[PDB]
A paper describes a structure:
RbAp46 and RbAp48 (pRB-associated proteins p46 and p48, also known as RBBP7 and RBBP4, respectively) are highly homologous histone chaperones that play key roles in establishing and maintaining chromatin structure. RbAp46 folds into a seven-bladed β propeller structure and binds histone H4 in a groove formed between an N-terminal α helix and an extended loop inserted into blade six. Surprisingly, histone H4 adopts a different conformation when interacting with RbAp46 than it does in either the nucleosome or in the complex with ASF1, another histone chaperone. Our structural and biochemical results suggest that when a histone H3/H4 dimer (or tetramer) binds to RbAp46 or RbAp48, helix 1 of histone H4 unfolds to interact with the histone chaperone.
We have solved the crystal structures of two human RbAp46/histone H4 complexes at high resolution. One complex contains a synthetic peptide encompassing residues 16–41 of histone H4, and the second includes the N-terminal tail of recombinant histone H4 (residues 1–48); these crystallized in different space groups. Crystals were obtained of selenomethionine-substituted RbAp46 in complex with the shorter H4 peptide. The structure was solved using single-wavelength anomalous dispersion (SAD) data. The resulting model was used in molecular replacement calculations to solve the native structures. In the selenomethionine derivative, two RbAp46/H4 complexes occupy the asymmetric unit, whereas in the native structure with H4 1–48, there is only one. The crystallographic data thus provide three independently determined structures of the complex, representing different lattice environments. The three structures are essentially the same and should contain all of the important features illustrating how histone H4 binds to RbAp46. The H4 peptide adopts an α-helical conformation that is similar in all three structures, except that somewhat more residues are ordered in the RbAp46/histone H4 peptide structure. In the complex with the peptide (residues 16–41), we observe residues 25–41, whereas for the recombinant fragment of H4 (residues 1–48), residues 27–41 are well defined.
Numbering used by the authors:
A (entry chain B): 7 to 89, 111 to 410
B (entry chain E): 27 to 41
């Protein structure tokens, strides 16, 4: 599958990135996994162990093998104090097929939902599985969520309504589950609601971070849809937005402003949206050389946004610099709101996650087995 | 060389 030509170009650009890292990073840790992960999410927990020079952090990872046994993994990592690093397996759980995406429940972080190459979305409570997985590889989810006909990626837990989960699928639908309901015994729960507003593969879904009834969806039909779970319709959203000129792959709500939303597309742009008036696209971020697949706001800075995708790059944006005049020289590198380009990966970035406890720290995973934990130099954002 | 802050900031945008 490899392009020996492109590989030489990538490798030589990497060597240049590597020696530039002391300029650009306060922290760079790189780890090669046996298998690539399509998913990353930091767990909310952190601790500074007595008599140690590092902090303990946790990552939810997955595995991607077509041939062999897959696993849902929680990784323990050492993050060195500002006065290299280490990764270990906290727990490893047998998983049928690759883990498309894995998300922890905000109210109960040891509950993790996963998307699979099949239609069932699985739920795991990692406190209810053996410390070491049985080599037989039999996958025993605590819950199987029924409702989809095809696989997907989009996953979202309601952070205001415990146990409520959204999922997006290639079958054109968004499914809704309430995992606290169901029968006594007990493993299978059916979709409470199935939303069919889209006419193509729905790529991502996301609850509003403040209103428990609002969520957004995003599809290959180039539309952004805003839904209300109160309403007795599941075929028509509250708002239908012509968001992009190509497939929309991701969306992310700002954790500081209940009205603003970000959207990422195959048209190589990120769009800013305001929920109070969706006829007007607030802004367009341009710089990416290929399809954008993931977008996430910083959990510490309201004006900071990050995006990534097929161009092996991760871009960090600063909203507070939009419209700011640049010299003709600086304009060649991109618009004034482009803060930082991360060139540490040598293949497509599958997913990334902002560290919720250490400002500016990000974990990104690529298709060539690499996971990087990094933090850009203070000199770059401290202006 | 590219040690000043404006230069580092410009390196950052170039990746
Ligand atoms: As591991």
């Amino acid at each position: 599958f490899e392009d020996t030509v492109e590989e030489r170009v990538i490798n030589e650009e990497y060597k240049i990135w590597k020696k530039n890292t002391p300029f650009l990073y306060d922290l760079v840790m790189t780890h090669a996994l046996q298998w690539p992960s399509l998913t990353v999410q930091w767990l909310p927990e952190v601790t500074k162990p007595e008599g140690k020079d590092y902090a303990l952090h946790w990552l939810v990872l997955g595995t991607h093998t077509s041939d062999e046994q897959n696993h849902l993994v929680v990784a323990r990592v050492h993050i060195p104090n500002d006065d290299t690093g280490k990764i270990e397996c906290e727990i490893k759980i047998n998983h049928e097929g690759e883990v498309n995406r894995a998300r922890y429940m905000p109210q109960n972080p040891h509950i993790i939902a996963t998307k699979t190459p099949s239609s069932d979305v699985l739920v795991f409570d990692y406190t209810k599985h053996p410390a070491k997985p049985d080599p037989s590889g039999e996958c025993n989810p605590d819950l199987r969520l029924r409702g989809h006909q095809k696989e997907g990626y989009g996953l979202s837990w309601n952070s205001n309504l415990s146990g409520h989960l959204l999922s997006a699928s290639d079958d054109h639908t968004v499914c809704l589950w309430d995992i606290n309901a169901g029968p006594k015994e007990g493993k299978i729960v059916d979709a409470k609601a199935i939303f069919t507003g889209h006419s193509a593969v729905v790529e991502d879904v996301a609850w509003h971070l403040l209103h428990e009834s609002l969520f957004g969806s995003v599809a290959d039909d180039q539309k952004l849809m805003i839904w209300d779970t109160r309403s007795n319709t599941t075929s028509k959203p509250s708002h239908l937005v012509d968001a992009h000129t190509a497939e929309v792959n991701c969306l992310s709500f700002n954790p500081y402003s209940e009205f603003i939303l970000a959207t990422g597309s195959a048209d190589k742009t990120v769009a800013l949206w305001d929920l109070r008036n969706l006829k007007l696209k607030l802004h367009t971020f341009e710089s990416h050389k290929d399809e954008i697949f993931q977008v996430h706001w910083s959990p510490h800075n309201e004006t900071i946004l990050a995006s990534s995708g097929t161009d092996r790059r991760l871009n960090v944006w600063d909203l507070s610099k939009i419209g700011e005049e640049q010299s003709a020289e600086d304009a060649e590198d991109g618009p004034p709101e482009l803060l930082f380009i991360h060139g540490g990966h040598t293949a497509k970035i599958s997913d990334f996650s902002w560290n919720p406890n250490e400002p500016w720290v990000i974990c990104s995973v690529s298709e060539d087995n690499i996971m990087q934990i990094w933090q850009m130099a203070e000199n770059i954002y401290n202006d | 060389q590219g040690i000043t802050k404006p230069a580092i900031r410009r390196l950052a945008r170039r990746g």
